[PDB]
């Protein structure tokens, strides 16, 4: 026999606004030549995108349920090639497990903390492909691809500290792996804009106040069917007996 089921999706909303008085605008213009309206407009337009960008990551980290552990410290004598092969094997196993869970194909990627980012950056040339003309930035940026498939982005330590402060546990050592689907009916994380943000400007009130408002709606949530199964979390450690600590340059607790 056969059976059928159903699933549903729906968007959400977001709102923001800013104010300033006439006298303040005149004071700024006279004393420094500023323009309060333009500054506030640009700030609103920027923050609206920034917050959604952060919210995506917050949801992804909060929803995950699959865990794994590994030790990445280098043996005191082994070359980098053997260790690189071992690491590649481990990550290939993890991705195979993810594929087996979902049972569909797709692209691969990673979210890595600063320490794991450095550990990956230490790898030799053929295993890891640095991004062209890479410049380190305080933002969350793209650093390169490894094994020719996985694209890895870096998360600065301060962002990890802020996330842990707000009860979302994400250490600087942690690494998050994901698979982006391509088939029509299936996906891991769903995004889209139902209504792009709309600006409104109100004229000067009898109280001599200027105000603008932005409103809009969009969808940012995990897929109802097996949406969480696409992601997994890995935490790394530096504790192996007879390991090499590259922070200090000697043996790890002998």
């Amino acid at each position: 026999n056969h059976e059928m089921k159903k699933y549903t999706l729906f968007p959400s909303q977001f709102v923001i606004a800013a104010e300033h008085t006439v006298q303040a605008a005149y004071e700024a213009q006279r004393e420094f030549g500023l323009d309060l309206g333009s500054l506030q407009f640009r700030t609103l337009k920027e923050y609206l995108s920034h917050e959604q960008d952060m919210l995506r990551l917050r949801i992804m980290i909060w929803r995950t349920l699959a865990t794994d552990t590994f030790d990445i410290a280098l043996p005191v004598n082994q070359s980098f090639d053997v260790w690189a092969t071992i690491i590649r094997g481990k990550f290939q196993t993890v991705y195979r497990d993810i594929i087996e869970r979902v049972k569909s194909s797709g692209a691969m990627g990673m979210f890595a903390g600063a320490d794991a980012a450095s550990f990956f950056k230490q790898l030799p040339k053929d295993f890891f492909q640095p991004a062209e003309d890479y410049i380190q930035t305080p933002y969350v940026h793209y650093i390169g691809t490894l094994f020719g498939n996985v694209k890895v982005y870096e998360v600065p330590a301060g962002i990890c500290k802020n996330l842990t402060t707000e009860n979302i546990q994400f250490s600087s050592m942690d690494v998050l792996c994901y698979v982006r689907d391509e088939n029509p009916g299936k996906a891991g994380f769903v995004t889209g804009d139902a209504v792009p943000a709309i600006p409104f400007q109100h004229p000067t009130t009898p109280a001599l106040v200027n105000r603008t408002t932005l409103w809009g709606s969009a969808i940012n949530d995990m897929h109802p069917r097996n949406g969480a199964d696409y992601f997994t979390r890995v935490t790394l450690t530096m504790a192996k007996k007879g390991g090499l600590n590259f922070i200090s340059g000697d043996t790890i607790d002998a």
Partner: protein
């Protein structure tokens, strides 16, 4: 070194910042917003942790926006969800009810009944059986702005 021009004896340099102008959401008025700032602010779909770790003997739980927000807040219809052990359930109907069930660790089935109050945003959860110790329960809702348009945050 970097080279700057100097003409008069004493010079001045000014800087401008970004500061949240309201206590709404995670932030408080006076906080500073930068590249590495994360928080719920201007997003209307949120989640809250109700019970960090469930005691064995407990059987009921109540949710009030006054505990998590400074004031009563209206809630939209048919958008509420509950998580048990971070597992989503179906959404509430448009009439103030929700029926959800999940399996206990030993193997029995536990049903959950909820009641809703959209005007003030208050939810009462009644467990059929006391859940296992250590479980956690979280709730996810969406704030109705058209009912209360005076909560719009500033900058």
């Amino acid at each position: 070194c970097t080279f700057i021009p100097v003409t008069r004896d004493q010079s001045d340099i000014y800087e401008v910042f970004n500061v949240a102008g309201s206590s709404f959401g995670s932030y408080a008025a006076g906080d500073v917003l930068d590249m590495q700032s994360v928080g719920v602010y201007s997003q209307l779909r949120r989640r809250y942790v109700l019970v960090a770790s469930s005691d064995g003997t407990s059987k009921t739980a109540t949710f009030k926006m006054e505990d998590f927000e400074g004031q009563n807040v209206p809630i939209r219809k048919g958008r509420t969800n509950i998580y048990v052990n971070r597992i989503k359930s179906v959404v509430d109907n448009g009439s103030g009810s929700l029926l959800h069930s999940f399996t206990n660790a030993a193997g029995e089935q536990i049903t959950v009944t909820c009641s809703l109050n959209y005007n003030i945003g208050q939810i009462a959860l009644s467990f059929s059986k006391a859940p296992d110790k250590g479980t956690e329960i979280a709730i996810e809702t969406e704030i109705n702005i058209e009912a209360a348009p005076e909560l719009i945050p500033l900058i």
